[PDB]
Structure 1
Amino acid sequence: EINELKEMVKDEHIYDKLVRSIAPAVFGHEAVKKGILLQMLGGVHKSTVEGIKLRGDINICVVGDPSTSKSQFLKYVVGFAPRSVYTSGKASSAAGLTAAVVRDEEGGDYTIEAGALMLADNGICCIDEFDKMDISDQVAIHEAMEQQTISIAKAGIHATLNARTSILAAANPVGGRYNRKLSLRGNLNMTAPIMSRFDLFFVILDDCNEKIDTELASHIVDLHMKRDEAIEPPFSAEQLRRYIKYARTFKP
């Protein structure tokens, strides 16, 4: 088992192979593939003398219209990563994201029930259709992004809970399509505090080129004809999990 890990560490094209092993079913879009890997790996958490906490999670937003293949990236991550959750904008309530309190039949105590953000602690939370979120939900997401805590005050229960999680979010342009003549802020529907703390914004735009269309169509038809014998990725999922686990234990 260590034989394969030490073989991986040596190869001096390992970065390109790792990039080419992510979301193999999707065609192209290498920038998003790099971003997702960097988000699965992580940064460093630091603390100053004055108790100021320096954050070390990377947050990504993918912007495209309903035509673009932006949900396949999210479905790949929710199938690969160890602790990940998939939620959608209008099928989710605030209590289902932060937490809820229920009482025991045994009597004498209460119990907390975890939400999407708590079930993704030290992990990636996937949100599809970020633009259909309410301001009430966005104030909780902002609290999870600046602080790593969730505050509960309902029915006389006070509790501070840990949400150390990264955000993967997909957003639709405000008017269906992306206006190249406006700025990024003009095309999105987010609160200023939320937009500021996102690290990378990836915009997927369509181009009309014949050779790319031929390649894409060939790929799509190949998958239907040949089932799963149409990928031949450099690495497998079980191989990739082990490398990610090993990589997260280094402190540069």
Structure 2
Amino acid sequence: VKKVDDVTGEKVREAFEQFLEDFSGEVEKVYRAQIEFMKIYDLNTIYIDYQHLSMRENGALAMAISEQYYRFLPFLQKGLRRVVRKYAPERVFQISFFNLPTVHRIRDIRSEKIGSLLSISGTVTRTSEVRPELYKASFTCDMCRAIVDNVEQSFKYTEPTFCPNPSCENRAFWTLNVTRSRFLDWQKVRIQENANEIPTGSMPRTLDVILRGDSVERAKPGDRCKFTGVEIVVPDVTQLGLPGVKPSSTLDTRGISKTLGVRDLTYKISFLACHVISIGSSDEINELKEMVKDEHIYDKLVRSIAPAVFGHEAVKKGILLQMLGGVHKSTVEGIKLRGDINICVVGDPSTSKSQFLKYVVGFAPRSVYTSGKASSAAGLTAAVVRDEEGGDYTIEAGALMLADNGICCIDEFDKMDISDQVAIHEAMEQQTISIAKAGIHATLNARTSILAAANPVGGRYNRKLSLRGNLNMTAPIMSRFDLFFVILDDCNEKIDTELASHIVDLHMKRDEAIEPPFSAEQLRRYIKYARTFKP
């Protein structure tokens, strides 16, 4: 019995084979060289640029693949297999598209584009462990001891549909052999919608992302990544109870001699991705050497921090030297010596202490901002999510877990409760956070520098009292803050005139009236280089 064929599928297969073979002032061809490279280094994946595919055949191939990637993926796989066999001597091969012309938001996904290839962006909230995934199972027939191999699953546990031999008339009676089947690595990742993309008056969305093969263990919680893959659907048992009419399926009973299997068709949109990249040397070593060879480099380094804030040089010289830290030392007896620097800025609500926090969070590489009263003990530290739908538990990072080896910003520090204060105390004393919830113990790393902004206890800083009498903190946390910058207001005609002129300049001129010695990228490069010296 001959199997039906799709002429269009074979046409696309031939087109893709020709594309691989025929793509090219020393001329070169990239894809053949890359196949040779894969042979040399024993890899599993091929990287293909989208524009290279697009600029041919009047875009027919690019379109057909774009809106029917799901249909044509097996034919692309077959074409790649044929090309590699022809031009090179079990192996699972993966293709990786990237550099699409446009990017979509998580808020603008539609059921029309199901089964097509697109690109999305979001912030990673959670990742699970890598687990084996059933790919091509093997079964043993029961009525006869025949053996069936290379049975595909296709997103769910599938069984053979008929015994391969007429000697046995078995069907639906099978056993699974876990000894001679293959698996692939499988990971689940939860991403969140970007902060600047959330519309007015609405809470953020989330989307499940599935990773396979060598793309696993790439995303990291707290990072922004751009994905590319297919938009798929999976069952949603949770949709019962919603209003509306939900499709049901029943077997047609016309044409059957005579003389119940109804199913529900509820689904939800997920995303199976193939390429993941994070979004944040070269000629610039000359620039780095030129700039280090400056002699008043320190003055510019100080002046380029918080350029939009008038004065307060000491706070800037603290924020610097908080980005750059000491060195961590270990004693023979096992006593560890700290290398982090902590700062507290004290002032009344009428001062500009919060702008320093905002600058740090907007500038520093791994920084998190939080408020004293808009936080929680689980919001800081971490939680455990034992409802992992496929297996064992997982742990979700809190505020302190993020910005590890970075800086944590805490405004309204004087509103923290006792439990969260003890959590910060534990983080400062030892760089660890201990979790004891739901019968699960764990230990985490909390090597973080804390930048806090506190208000005086009475609203105004009574200069008759000492620092201890004007604060609300507890002795342990207060005894680890190595710098206390108390900023007060002095009435002076020239200072007031200068401040007013600067503010009016900023409103009238906007971006023009900034003129800092160095750019933010330059500062980041300098700090990245300088954090690796160990004086």
Cα distance per residue 1:35-57 (max 9 Å; x no partner): 00100000000000110000000
Alpha-carbon distance in structure 2 between the residues aligned to 1:103 and 1:46:
37
Alpha-carbon distance in structure 1 between the residues aligned to 2:390 and 2:443:
23
Post-superposition shift, 1:8?
A: 1.2
Post-superposition shift, 1:227?
A: 1.1
Alpha-carbon distance in structure 1 between the residues aligned to 2:455 and 2:449:
20
Alpha-carbon distance in structure 2 between the residues aligned to 1:220 and 1:106:
54
- TM (normalized to structure 1)? 0.99
Where does structure 2 lack aligned partners over 5 or more consecutive residues? 1-283
8 A Cα contact 2:406 2:448, kept in partner: yes
Post-superposition shift, 1:104?
A: 3.9
Post-superposition shift, 1:245?
A: 0.1
Alpha-carbon distance in structure 2 between the residues aligned to 1:191 and 1:86:
22
Cα distance per residue 1:45-84 (max 9 Å; x no partner): 0000110000000000000000000000000000001100
Alpha-carbon distance in structure 2 between the residues aligned to 1:179 and 1:4:
49
Alpha-carbon distance in structure 1 between the residues aligned to 2:388 and 2:445:
26
Q: CA RMSD, aligned part only?
A: 0.7
Q: Secondary structure at the match of 1:82?
A: coil
Cα distance per residue 1:190-222 (max 9 Å; x no partner): 000000000000001100000010000000000
Cα distance per residue 1:115-165 (max 9 Å; x no partner): 010001000000001000001100000000010000001111000000000
8 A Cα contact 2:388 2:394, kept in partner: no
Alpha-carbon distance in structure 2 between the residues aligned to 1:135 and 1:12:
48
Post-superposition shift, 1:105?
A: 3.9
Q: Secondary structure at the match of 2:323?
A: helix
Post-superposition shift, 1:175?
A: 0.3
8 A Cα contact 2:408 2:450, kept in partner: yes
Alpha-carbon distance in structure 2 between the residues aligned to 1:198 and 1:94:
21
Equivalent residue for 1:13? 296
Alpha-carbon distance in structure 2 between the residues aligned to 1:3 and 1:80:
24
Relative to its length, the structure with more strand (as a share) is: 2
Q: Which runs of 4+ in 1 moved over 6 A?
A: none
Equivalent residue for 1:31? 314
Percent identity, aligned pairs only?
100
Selected match of 1:131 from 414, 426, 447: 414
Q: Secondary structure at the match of 1:15?
A: helix
Q: Secondary structure at the match of 1:242?
A: helix
Alpha-carbon distance in structure 1 between the residues aligned to 2:439 and 2:391:
14
- TM (normalized to structure 2)? 0.47
Greater relative CO (CA pairs within 8 A, separation 6+): 1
Q: Secondary structure at the match of 1:67?
A: coil
Q: Secondary structure at the match of 2:318?
A: helix
Post-superposition shift, 1:103?
A: 2.2
Q: Secondary structure at the match of 1:161?
A: strand
Selected match of 1:187 from 467, 470, 481: 470
Cα distance per residue 1:91-122 (max 9 Å; x no partner): 00000100011124434310100001000100
Alpha-carbon distance in structure 2 between the residues aligned to 1:249 and 1:221:
41
Alpha-carbon distance in structure 2 between the residues aligned to 1:67 and 1:105:
47
Cα distance per residue 1:11-33 (max 9 Å; x no partner): 11000000000000000000000
Count of equivalent residues: 252
8 A Cα contact 2:370 2:409, kept in partner: yes
Where does structure 1 lack aligned partners over 5 or more consecutive residues? none
Alpha-carbon distance in structure 2 between the residues aligned to 1:194 and 1:58:
13
Structure whose CA Rg is larger = 2
Alpha-carbon distance in structure 2 between the residues aligned to 1:216 and 1:136:
41
